Each structure stands twice: as C-alpha cells, then as structure tokens.
Amino acid sequence: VQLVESGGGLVQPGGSLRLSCAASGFNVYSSSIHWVRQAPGKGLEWVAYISSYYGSTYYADSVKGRFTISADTSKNTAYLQMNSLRAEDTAVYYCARIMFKWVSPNMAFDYWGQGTLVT
Amino acid sequence: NKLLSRMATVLVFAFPVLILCVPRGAGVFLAGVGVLALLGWRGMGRAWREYSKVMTPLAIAVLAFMLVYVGSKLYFHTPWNVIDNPSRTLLAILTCWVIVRAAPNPAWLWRGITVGLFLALLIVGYQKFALNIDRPSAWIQAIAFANMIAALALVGFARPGDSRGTHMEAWVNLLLGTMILMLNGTRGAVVAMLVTSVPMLMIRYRRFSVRMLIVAVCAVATLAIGAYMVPDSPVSKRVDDAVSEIQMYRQGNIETSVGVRLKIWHIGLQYFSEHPWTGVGVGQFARILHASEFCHETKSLACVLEHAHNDIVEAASTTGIPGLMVMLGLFLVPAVLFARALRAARSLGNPQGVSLGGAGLGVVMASLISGLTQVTMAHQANVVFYAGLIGLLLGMAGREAHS
Amino acid sequence: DIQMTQSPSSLSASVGDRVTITCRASQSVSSAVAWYQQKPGKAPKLLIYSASSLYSGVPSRFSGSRSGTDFTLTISSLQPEDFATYYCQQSYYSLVTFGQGTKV
C-alpha cells in the first residue's frame, strides 16, 4: 500500500495548480483521502478531504471557495485543484489516508505520501 | 397499589428520552428503577413466585453467565476491571423484577419511542449541520448510539394496531431511525436494521403470512442479484469493494480491512481449537496476538488490537466452551422467552402482547446481527442499554401473556 | 472553529528521562485525538489513535491517556531515535485541526 503525489513547482501568485495523488494497494472510493500542508519551518495545516462513499467534502477556512478536491475511482487517484493562489500558500503538500472505520470510528491518519513542494 | 402502576407507566414512557437524549440518562433511569423497588417491600417476595416461568430464565441465565465469567479470574489473574462491564448485565434482572411487581401501561411505551426518536433526530441534526461534527452522536459513542437508535426504531416498529394512523406512525418510526443512522454514518447498522425489519413485517401487517414474506424476500434477493448483470451502478462497485480484498487474502498479501478481519478471526478460531475448554482467559485477547507466530514474523495492524470484533469468535477464543455457551445463552434465552409469550398472547387474542413479543424478538435478532460484526460486550453503554431494554420489554410481555 | 494548544512548545531531555506532552482543546472532543511523530524533512507517522491505543510498529514505550478535555502523551524512556517533533490532531469536529506542534 503506497501513496505518491506529484504536480508541484514554481507558480506566480494569482495562478492555478493541480496535484495528483496516485494511490496503490487499495481503492480510493473505499477510504477517505485527506490533503494536508505544512508551511516551511511551521506546523501542519489541514485543508480538505472527501468522504468515503458519499463524496461529501469539507474545506478549511482559508482555502474554502478556491480549492477543488476530487476523486476518480476509474483511475484510483485523488486530485486537489487550487485557484487564485497567494504567497501564503507556499508549503509542502502531503497525502493522507484514515484507518479502517471499524478499527477507529474517528479519523486517524496512518499511511502518508512523500509530499511535494509548491511555491 | 395504583401509584406504582402510574409511576412505572411514566417511567417506561420517559425511558427512551432519558437514554437517548438526556446526557446522563442511564444513571437517572437506574435511580428511577430504584425509587420503585424501594417502595414495595413485601412485594417482590410474592412476585417472583407468580412469574417464575419467565423470571427464572432471566435470573439463572444471568447468574450462570456471571459465575462462568468470574470463574476465569481464579487462574487467569487479570484485574477486576474486566468484570466491571458484565456487572451491568445483572441490571436486567432488577429492571424485569421491578416491572413484574409494578404493572405498567405499555400503551405509553410506543409514544415514548416515537417522541425519543424525533427528539434524537432533532439533536443529531443540530450536531451535524451547525456544530460541525463528523460522528454526530448525542452524548455517547457513535457505534453504541447507532445500536441504541436501531433497537429503539425496531421496538417502535411493532406498533399495536391496524389503522391508517398506526401504519403511519410505524412507518415514520423506521423513517426517523434511518435518517438518524445515516446522519451518523455507520451504514452497517443501517443494513442490519433493514434486514432485521423484514421478518418483523410478520408483526407489522397481520395479513401477510409466511408465504407473503418468502415471496417478498425472494423478490428482494432477485433485485439485488440484478446488479451484476450491468456492473456500472454504485450497487455493483461497493460489494465489489471486498472481492479484491478476499482474493488478495487468499494470496500472500493480507493488509486490508477484510483481510485483517479474517486474519484475526482465523488466529482466534485456531487458538480456540488448540484450547477447547478454557482459552487465554476473560478479556485478555491481546495475549493470543502477542504470543502467536504470525505477529512474530510481521507487524501488521492485526497484531495491536485489544479485542476481536466478532462476538462468536471473541467469546470463544477468550473463554472457551463454557464461555461460548453462556454468551450465546445471554441472547438466546430471551429469544426463547419471547416466543413463549408471543404464542400465548396469540392464543389469547390480546394484540398488544403479540406486538410486544414481536418487538422483543426483533431486538434479539438485531443484537445478534450487530454482534456478527462487532463485540457488543466492550461498550458499557451498549451493555447497560441492552440489559435494560431486554429486561423491560419482557416484563410487560409476560404481564400481558399471563393476564 | 476549534483551537488546539500544546505545552511545552519545545523541551529537551536526556536519554532515559520520561517526558510528557499535553494537548489541550477549545471545545469538548470525546476521544478523537491522535498523535503523530514528524522527523525533519520526512512524512509524519501515526503513533496513538483514539488517544489510548497504539498503532502497529510503534514500541510499547509510547502511551497516551485522557483526563477530561486535557489530553496528555508520555513516553516510557527516551532512545536516540525518539528526538523528533510531535503533533496532536482532533477529529471529532468535521473540520479537523492540528496543534501548534511540540519539539523534542
């Protein structure tokens, strides 16, 4: 079970960028995939996720209205699409997968990704 | 004489509201039970004698459970904290004995059911839509609350009557139940309640007999099988979510939910095979995983769980043959006492007792089905609620069956 | 929303001395707080879930407990590979939040 993400790079403020979080060893439509970012020399910051089956989504206060998270069970991949980025969005972006619902009724991140840097 | 009847009636009216909505409702209801038993002192010495055909297979079956469940400690020196949860299954004896002495009016029980379901729906709606919560349970654990909601809805499905309004209330009971469950996720409880409510159509509509249930389940099964002929709709690709898991488990890689669950079940049912009579002990399931030869060669998630997630496997592995028999009995003996009251009420006409027996049987079936995927013994709230409800329904069921 | 605070923000202790980390919460989270260890320039890994259960591949030295709404983590002893940052995440509310992040 591995999760890999790519798509980061240099982008000027006001543009747009899309990150693809390829997954392996499980089905993206089964569990829930969470994006999380960490500012350089700072703590982790949550942004959004998607529900397991319903597809319901929630967004953080700062990224709401411009970030579009999506899933595609055909390719077993998860994507996060950002619009109108500012200079405060520079951080390293990680993937995240919760444990099984029965082992932990409350969400708990166990398998992560290598991460990508956006600037 | 009469005052005990009126206060027991209002208590059974308010029991669902207290348990589901009131935060510390278990303690309040256990005080309400005590303030009734403390009132009849020379009673209950001539109430055990009157219903010893129903009371005794609710007392002996629990005393044997407790004795076998504490007789593990004499050797398996685990601390007493294990038997603090089965200390809550003795409350069924008290909550049946109090009802037997103080005859209630179970006409208000159904009104309490629907009031509690609607108020719980309002509470969960507030806690999910405004105070954003991932698992909107009122004041207890999400899984335990889901079990509570399913049991309350299934009890309320057995509304006594055959009329427009009674059918409306019965249907609204399941509608509110499924809304509450879906708002709380845990759709496993939803499917358990849906499959449990199908045999209860026997009690619901007193026209549809065994054949008019067999045909219905055949049609439902055919509709379900109709999905795979076109595997594009979400129906096909959610039961297809475990086909890969099981086919992988049959192969070398076992690091998946179905795979982990099956590996734990096998490591439990092989230890049970090696130790037929007594296992590692009461509780103490982690010793099997910590001492096995699979966890010594890999550090998979199956090697850190405190307890198994299958009652028929957890009880068998931890206790053994006597423990398995007593654990089965704790659910089946009520299931045999409800049938013997349902048939009596059927022979007496008396539709209210018939519906009560049907509700009790449905609760037993739902508890078994839920235990088929989780251990209901761990959650103290689940244990105390099940004991209270199973000792409260059978009280009025026996009262109506006898007279 | 919900604000999580950690104390101390940065503490240092020699090997063999047990250290405790406290994660507080603005509102009431029943048990939906997990703990993570992050090494410099590496993806964090789960340590404790539901605040009282260890995760696979985590030695039994790590342990957590709950006291009301003040959540604490402690370690049996410090080994040289245990010097890394720690974080606490609350998952009760649908909008999860990470703490400030302590450093060892």
Please name the amino acid found at residue B272.
Answer: F
In whole angstroms, what is the distance from residue B105 CA to residue B44 CA?
19
Map residue B63 onto helix, strand or coil. helix
Please name the amino acid found at residue B127.
Answer: Q
* C91: closest chain B residue by CA: B134
Q: Domains in chain C, start-ordered, CATH in brackets?
A: 4-103 (2.60.40.10)
How far from B327 is each of B154, B318, B321, B362, B397, CA to CA, in Å?
23, 11, 10, 19, 23
Please name the amino acid found at residue A44.
Answer: L
Q: Which residue shows structure tokens 């068998």?
A: B316
State which H helix or E strand residue C46 sits in. strand C45-49
CB B387 within 8 A of CB B333: no
Please name the amino acid found at residue B339.
Answer: A
Q: Is the dihedral of CA B110, B333, B92, B401 positive or negative?
A: positive
Contacts of A101 by beta carbon, 8 Å cutoff, 6+ apart? A52, B185, B186
- Ranges of H-type helices in B130-183: 142-157, 164-183
In whole angstroms, what is the distance from residue B358 CA to residue B204 CA?
9
A45 close to C (CB below 8 A) = yes
The residues facing A36 across adjacent strands are A46, A94
A100 close to B (CB below 8 A) = yes
Task: Determine if the peptide bond prior to C40 is cis (ω within 30°).
Answer: no
Token representation of residue A47: 């942004």
Please name the amino acid found at residue B147.
Answer: N
Cβ of B309 within 8 Å of Cβ of A107? The answer is no
Q: In units of Å, what resolution does this entry have?
A: 3.5
In whole angstroms, what is the distance from residue B2 CA to residue B144 CA?
36
In whole angstroms, what is the distance from residue A94 CA to residue A116 CA?
7
CB C101 within 8 A of CB A39: no
Contacts of B395 by beta carbon, 8 Å cutoff, 6+ apart? B95, B96, B98, B99, B100, B104
As a dihedral over the C-alpha atoms of residue B249, residue B255, residue B260, residue B264, rounded to 10 degrees, the angle is 90
In whole angstroms, what is the distance from residue B315 CA to residue B322 CA?
10
In whole angstroms, what is the distance from residue C25 CA to residue C9 CA?
15
Token representation of residue B351: 């539709």
- Domain positions in chain A are 2-118
DSSP string, A47-100: EEEE-SSS--EEE-TTTTTTEEEEEETTTTEEEEEEES--GGG-EEEEEEEE--
Top-level class of domain A2-118: mainly beta
Distance of CA B89 to the CA centre of its chain: 13
Token representation of residue B198: 């199908």
Min Cα separation A97/chain C (Å) = 11
Token representation of residue A114: 């290598």
CB A76 within 8 A of CB A28: yes
Q: Is the dihedral of CA B124, B392, B360, A101 positive or negative?
A: positive
Cβ of C43 within 8 Å of Cβ of A115? The answer is yes
Burial classification of residue B91, based on how many CB atoms lie within 10 Å of its CB (0-12 exposed, 13-18 middle, 19 or more buried): buried
* A2: closest chain B residue by CA: B255
Min Cα separation A115/chain C (Å) = 7
**Other CB atoms closer than 10 Å to residue A9's CB: what's the count?**
10
Token representation of residue B208: 């549809």
Angle, helices B380-402/B2-20, rounded to nearest 10 degrees: 150
In whole angstroms, what is the distance from residue B216 CA to residue B206 CA?
15
